[PDB]
Paper text:
The SARS-CoV-2 genome is replicated and transcribed by its RNA-dependent RNA polymerase holoenzyme [holo-RdRp, subunit composition nsp7/nsp82/nsp12 (3, 4)] in a replication–transcription complex (RTC), which is the target for antivirals such as remdesivir (Rdv). The nsp13 helicase translocates on single-stranded nucleic acid in the 5′→3′ direction. Translocation of each enzyme opposes each other, and if the helicase prevails it is expected to push the RdRp backward on the t-RNA. This reversible backward sliding, termed backtracking, is a well-studied feature of the cellular DNA-dependent RNA polymerases (DdRps). Our results establish that the SARS-CoV-2 RTC backtracks, that backtracking is facilitated by the nsp13 helicase, and that the resulting single-stranded 3′ segment of the p-RNA extrudes out the RdRp NTP entry tunnel in a manner analogous to the evolutionarily unrelated cellular DdRps.
Therefore, to determine the structural organization of the SARS-CoV-2 BTC, we assembled nsp13(ADP-AlF3) and holo-RdRp with the BTC5 scaffold (hereafter called BTC5) and analyzed the samples by single-particle cryo-EM. The sample comprised two major classes: nsp131-BTC5 (3.4-Å nominal resolution) and nsp132-BTC5 (3.6 Å). Analysis of the two refined structures revealed that the RdRp portion of each structure was essentially identical (rmsd of 927 nsp12 α-carbon positions <0.3 Å), while the disposition of the common nsp13 protomer (nsp13.1) was divergent (rmsd of 590 nsp13 α-carbon positions >8 Å). In the nsp131-BTC5 and nsp132-BTC5 cryo-EM maps, the single-stranded 5′ segment of the t-RNA was engaged with nsp13.1. This region of the cryo-EM density was well-resolved, allowing identification of the t-RNA segment engaged within the helicase as +14 to +8 (numbering defined in Fig. 1A), 5′CCCAUGU3′. The five-nucleotide segment connecting the t-RNA between the helicase and the RdRp (+7 to +3) was disordered and not modeled. The cryo-EM maps also resolved a single-stranded p-RNA 3′ segment of the BTC5 scaffold extruding into the RdRp NTP entry tunnel, confirming the formation of a BTC. By contrast, the BTC structures were translocated by one base pair compared to the RTCs; the base pair corresponding to the A–U Watson–Crick base pair at the 3′ end of the p-RNA (located in the −1 site of the RTCs) was in the −2 position of the BTCs. The −1 position of the BTC was occupied by the first C–A mismatch; the p-RNA −1C made a non-Watson–Crick hydrogen bond with the opposing t-RNA A. The next three mismatched p-RNA nucleotides (+1C, +2C, and +3C) trailed into the NTP entry tunnel.
Numbering used by the authors:
A (entry chain A): 3 to 929
B (entry chain B): 6 to 191
C (entry chain D): 7 to 191
D (entry chain C): 1 to 75
E (entry chain E): 1 to 590
The structure:
Amino acid sequence: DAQSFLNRVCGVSAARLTPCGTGTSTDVVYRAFDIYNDKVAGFAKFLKTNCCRFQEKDEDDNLIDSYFVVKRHTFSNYQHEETIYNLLKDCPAVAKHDFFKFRIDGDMVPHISRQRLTKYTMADLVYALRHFDEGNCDTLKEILVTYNCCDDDYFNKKDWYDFVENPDILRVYANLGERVRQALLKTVQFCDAMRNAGIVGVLTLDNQDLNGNWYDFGDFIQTTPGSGVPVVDSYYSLLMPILTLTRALTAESHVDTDLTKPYIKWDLLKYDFTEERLKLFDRYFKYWDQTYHPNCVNCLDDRCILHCANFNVLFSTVFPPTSFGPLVRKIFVDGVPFVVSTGYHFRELGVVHNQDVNLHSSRLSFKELLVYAADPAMHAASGNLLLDKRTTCFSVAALTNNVAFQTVKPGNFNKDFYDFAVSKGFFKEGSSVELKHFFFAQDGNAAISDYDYYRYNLPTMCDIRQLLFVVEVVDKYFDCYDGGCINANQVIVNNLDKSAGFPFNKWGKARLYYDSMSYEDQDALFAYTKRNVIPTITQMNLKYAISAKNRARTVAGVSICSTMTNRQFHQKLLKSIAATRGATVVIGTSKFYGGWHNMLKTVYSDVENPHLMGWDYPKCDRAMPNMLRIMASLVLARKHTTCCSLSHRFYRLANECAQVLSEMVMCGGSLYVKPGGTSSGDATTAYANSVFNICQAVTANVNALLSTDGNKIADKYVRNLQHRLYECLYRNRDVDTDFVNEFYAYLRKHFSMMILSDDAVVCFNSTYASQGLVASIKNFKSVLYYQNNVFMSEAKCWTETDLTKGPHEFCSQHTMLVKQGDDYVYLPYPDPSRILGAGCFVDDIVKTDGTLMIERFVSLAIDAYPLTKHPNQEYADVFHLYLQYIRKLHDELTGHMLDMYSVMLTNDNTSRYWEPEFYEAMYTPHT
Amino acid sequence: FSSLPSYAAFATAQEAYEQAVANGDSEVVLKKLKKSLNVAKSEFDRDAAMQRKLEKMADQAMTQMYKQARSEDKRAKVTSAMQTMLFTMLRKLDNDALNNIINNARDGCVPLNIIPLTTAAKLMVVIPDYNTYKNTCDGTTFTYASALWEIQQVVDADSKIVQLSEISMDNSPNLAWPLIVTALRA
Amino acid sequence: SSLPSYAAFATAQEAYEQAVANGDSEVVLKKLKKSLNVAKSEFDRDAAMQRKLEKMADQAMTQMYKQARSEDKRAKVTSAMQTMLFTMLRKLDNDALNNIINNARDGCVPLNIIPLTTAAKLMVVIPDYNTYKNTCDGTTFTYASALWEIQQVVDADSKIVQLSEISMDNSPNLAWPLIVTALRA
Amino acid sequence: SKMSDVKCTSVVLLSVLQQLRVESSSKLWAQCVQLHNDILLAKDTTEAFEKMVSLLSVLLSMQGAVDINKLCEEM
Amino acid sequence: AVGACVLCNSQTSLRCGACIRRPFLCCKCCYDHVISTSHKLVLSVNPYVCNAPGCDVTDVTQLYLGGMSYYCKSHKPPISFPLCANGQVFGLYKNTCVGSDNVTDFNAIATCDWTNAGDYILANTCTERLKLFAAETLKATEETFKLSYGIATVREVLSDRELHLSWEVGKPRPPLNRNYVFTGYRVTKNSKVQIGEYTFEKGDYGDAVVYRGTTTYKLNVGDYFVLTSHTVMPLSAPTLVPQEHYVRITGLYPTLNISDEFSSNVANYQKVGMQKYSTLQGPPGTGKSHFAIGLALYYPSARIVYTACSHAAVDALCEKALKYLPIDKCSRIIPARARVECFDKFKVNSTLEQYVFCTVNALPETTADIVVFDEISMATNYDLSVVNARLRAKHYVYIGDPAQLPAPRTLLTKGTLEPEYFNSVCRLMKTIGPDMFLGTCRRCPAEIVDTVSALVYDNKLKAHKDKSAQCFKMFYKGVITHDVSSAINRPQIGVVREFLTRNPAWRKAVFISPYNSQNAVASKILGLPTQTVDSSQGSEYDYVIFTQTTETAHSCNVNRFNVAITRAKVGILCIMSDRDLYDKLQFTSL
RNA sequence: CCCAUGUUAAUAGCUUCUUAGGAGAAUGACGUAGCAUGCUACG
RNA sequence: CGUAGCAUGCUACGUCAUUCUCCUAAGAAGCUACCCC
Ligand SMILES: [Zn+2]
Ligand SMILES: [Zn+2]
Ligand SMILES: [Zn+2]
Ligand SMILES: [Zn+2]
Ligand SMILES: [Zn+2]
């Protein structure tokens, strides 16, 4: 019967039980296994049917969250798990089992009744937090409600899952903190009780109920006691993005590690936390297999820098934030005391010391003067303390004596052209072409209410056993190019009249510093940054240019002592990426001269059933986690296998991470600390953004391929691909270049990509992405949720099911399949309102004049020519408007230049800019 | 390039040819003088082209040197400017508390983020509204970074001074709100 | 191109045309051909020098023009913008902008930003009993093509007056730039 | 065609106000910029005009910066 | 760079660079200017010089343009064309330049150096552009006349309080006064740069200066002093705004029951309110400067700028206004240099205050509601143009009398200028009649005002007073000493001192002397407050001591002595060196 | 023979213009070689 | 018939002048992507 069974399951711990399911039979539940055997591998949602789970109700008949799973299996497994439990009985992190043989129908079946497991095991939390999907998240709302984090009204809010539109969600997730951290601690008890009892097993995630207990001893072989080994390669490496989403290591900030105690008071002048980091690592991640050097300057290569760097990006959320940044030291120059930065202490790469410190120096060359004038040691040390309440970021100092407010004046108005446009029938009511791109103004405090957006940059502990394979696949994507350090005399500066950083813009443009320094002391600077760190102030200034929305666009100008060396380091790679045609990273491929068609025909590199797809990272340059920027700068620095040693390729990474990633932003007369994310003003920003974009696309692919149901994959090759992808991710420690080649061939046969720094177009096979073997949009939403720490709503990522219409919007230019000559090309046409908005609203009162700028409407008409082939008409009229306006402009120009002098221009050749042959020649594949 | 002797030879060959024309010289004299005029003219034209090449090269070198002199002077000017800025920022340092805290450290290294916090004698608090002002620096002597600061000036957004009795909940709207309050350590 | 080199070219070309009309000689014809060719080379050198000069005197025509017009355009900008603004405001011909402009041409300026939300405060000066007679009526105040209810009418001495002192006969007894403080209705 | 003639007139008007050195009054330049940005985004003609009136009232508020009597008299 | 012609306002790019002010000129106007006068140099965007390696011919009736350069006849290109041809001179805008017939007046204004009297009478009757150009050219000539002055240096330093002088031989000695400031240098083989600005004031004994200055740096032997001119900025505003008789009082709001004193000026106040600008004329001491303050008190809501050309006149207007206006709404504007002291009783240097008081050459760029320009008999067309350019107001008043002493007019040395040619406003007053006219002398005792009514007026001025028995004339000669053109008379001061303690009631009797050096050296002798006759306009003094220091053509002029005598409130003692002036008036014998 | 005065980054693509260099092509003048032809003289 | 001298026409190379084309470098002006939709 079904009551004697319940009375037996009650056992000795007399608890009232209500049976889930019905009538002494199994209960079928959709759970979140992390499984790997001969048939199936992956971390995916399976359907378990061998657990007659009861529920324990306390007094007053309330159902508390404590179950009695009664898994039944073969007799051999019952005996083996009985002996293993009798070995691991005494530890606290083992849920109390109860073995009993019960007569089910005609014979005895052996049941293994666990006692007081919670409902959702840890893998269910990790899965529902990694594979988020706002329509189907019922195993995350229930977890958040049932552990008193939010009271079930939080989920009636508009956007409760967002990190950008609802930062309070972090306060929700952090309430799981001491429930994950305790879990971690209980694992380090279990592992100990495993090793001291001699058991060799794999610690999967889905065997730990959310309290912390462990309850599965199926595949635990036993060996000589005191010499066992637990394998936590795939436990601590699925739980890693949850250890900074849910901030599980904040209880290590309070004294005696109790959340009720007051904060700990670390000494202000304590910069070397190496012993504390080692203590945290040996308390939480004890049985993690690999080594760990807290100061990454001890690391072996660019795969033990990602590992230790991603560990430190978690261990450095417990140390005070007023102890990072440069490490100053008082030196003497000709007997007068400077204070200069002799190192750095970054939260990712530990403590880094300089090797060239010259105390008691006598004179200063130009190199040493530049170095001492650039780094913020003098500027912060000789400025008054600042407490800015407008920003949640830090606030190092205030150089001036009063904070300077900067405004953005409204743009001018080209009334001659606007009256001409309304003459030709534009700007009516109901026109499909309407002015939407204007010149917006800004308040006083704009530059400091936009820098505040760096509050979106949380310290994210990116998963480490999968980043150390996604970096291999990305490096395969970057294999066609060549790079290396170049001497000082081969650096090519595009524009030299551009301002240079904070401390150098008081004296001249970049031309002054590129002309003052000779090649010898411009190469000595670069050979100096390869053996020590140069911290650098970077100014943050508002941009005055046309736009479509109010928010001010701040651009960061980095000091010339940083760009002058990043160019030398990265220029061969950055000018071989921009000169190779037909690759994934299409930077330097002209959209003119039949180059857009060639892009769009090397995207369709023979994928079976194409569907175009484009995503869009929200707050890409402000929410990019630190670890992905370090990975981008390590993939862009892998070309130096001969020109640099290893300690020269580490101080270059430290210099990039000190002058770009985590710098001191001079934001309107005050030095703040920039928490992270790329600053779009250095040499490697479009290309570093390209590497990060490829990393997110490949990570989404890996997630989508692993997280499939395993035995539903009919293609007996892709199933083996998944079963070996899991093995090369977690159960393998060194590179497996044959499989990396195989998976990259799979990616470029079924997920052909086209990347311009974050502007991606994908031509994915649609049958596979419908099955689930290739990342559709939902996988990108999940990957951005747990790695990029923002939620990418599905209303800003497009999917084109047709190909005779091209990508919907790539590089902000739509694509149309027009007929040209006798074949069909893809012309790229711009937004037909941006062209008008850039004609009417010039940004300098001299450009309002008209007749001076004919060589400006020529460029606008060149960019807006593909509109004449648009099937619409108010789009096709923009080009003819520009032609007629260039004709009028030249007529009145000759009128004025005939009245001014008395003879017209003789060799005048402006008679071809108002005829469509010249513009049509610019979208034809000849040149 | 009339200064070269090739121009003189060309001129005297032309003079001989003109004398032959005026005096009605015979065919032999005309052909001999024409051959001499041809070779002299070709040599003079080559010499003039060479003179143009040399003069243009000399002008290019002169512009190169009179641009490099300007560059080398600008180097010294910016070096003087950098030295002046460094030494003024040096003399601005609160050279006693800084020395005390640096010599209080184990290796002489202290993080830069605690160099203002423990040495800077002036504190600029920037306040965006009134609730923040009430919460952080109410009264005249607030407390930040574990030291007792005393307010000495409160300038508003457009750099007009404000007496600390004008800041109240019923006078909050009539200000320009990001309120830089400058205080001194005490 | 009407220069003496072209005159020599023209007379030599006429001589060669005469020779072509004859067309039965070798030595004198070849000498004429050589004379035409050398004169043509001299003329073409002169034409090349003149054409180089003539296209050099356009990079100094265009440059001078777009320096003179640029320095004219960026020096007359405090007045160009204002004239353009009031031209455009006369072009809109809205009932509200025209009303506040046609009042502010007669002293009746507003002393703060005209509010938007209902029951918000506006302080506008009134310089005469004429402008008070047009805009005000009873406790109503027609400004910016909207009706406002009058809270206070303070004269230039900032001494509050009532709306019954302001009559035609009793007009000149007050200090006239009356600040009327009204609420939007 | 009068909806997209308040978006351009507002740009000219804010340029005029900025040339009158109204930047150096933060409490007033914040309101002028807010009205400018809310005119340029408003898609309803009545709302754009009711914000244009309040933006123009800043220009008429300052007593003798512009010369309104001379400017409008060119009709 | 292009511009507008002076005679016709057409567009052009020609500047007749021989003229002192370098005016723009159209094509035809420049042709007429170079065909007639001796001015042959016409700077286009590039100067019209023969662009040969070495050649100096600058006439623009000869030079021919060829290729891209202008050459003379001795280097003319084989293909070229003359500039000065077809009745024009080839510049930009060659075909849209309408000529003007005023070329003769332009020639007479640009050619002359302002020494003949007729130059002023022609420079003050032509059109508006010619009026502005004439005033600008005269100011440029006056300022460049300081380039002909001398240079001082030091042989020894007596002390930090008194300095010795050594003038450079071959240059005239600059007189020691307030205006002619000096700047230091040290050109001894190194450091040919300025060091600071000082000023000179001669000591009583010997030939030395008790120097002052911005700083107090020690003057080494290498250091020496040079004078310079600031600039002559081009004026643009018209001399007089176009008058427009309004229908009613617009822009000004009257007041109820103004006062008791100003009850006779209400009609004039409403006349000022009615028109655009107005002109007030009256004999000295007749409410002219006080009617302006009464207008301020009659238009309380109207922001007012009072301005005057000198400093003593504006200071006197300031003190009278303070005696009649609230100091809560009142100000004063001083220059950064301030070579003379100011009226430090108002909240000095607050432009936004309602009642701004200032000097013409120091006004700020501002609006007003009615601006009162006082003493338009002490201002040239440069001053009127500056007051019409810098500040703009809805109502202008110009208050002053033609028969007072005119502007100094340094450049003039031949002939005497009729009042109706002093400036534009005096022309408007003496030709068509002043807008307001108030004559009844509310200032001076009946004796001296009766005397001055017979000399400089036609026996029409009247005053409400009687003989005060305090009007004395003392006949003397004095020994004339002509130091640095600033005359000094020795025994006049001694006579005053010997007859100062005889009547100790004249203890504050202000001392009036035509020359600045007599004023400066008489401070240490008598100790009385003292002022010069040129600056004597505006103020009032209880007891006055006016001494004709040296009998020259300067102090023999009736207007200067009339302005000197009509400053006495209750008492006047005048010492005369003129034989006629001791009997020109009618006082007690004394 | 004299007296008033100073208020805004990195990277990439493209268009236009200028200069310099190189190469090629075409024509013309000239020079030096090679080929053919015509005249006179010695042998 | 060879050679010498002179003359005429034809091919190769070189110098110079002119025109055209292409490229390579340097400089200046401008636009777009970038930025938020
Ligand atoms: Zn390591
Ligand atoms: Zn390298
Ligand atoms: Zn002249
Ligand atoms: Zn003219
Ligand atoms: Zn010459």
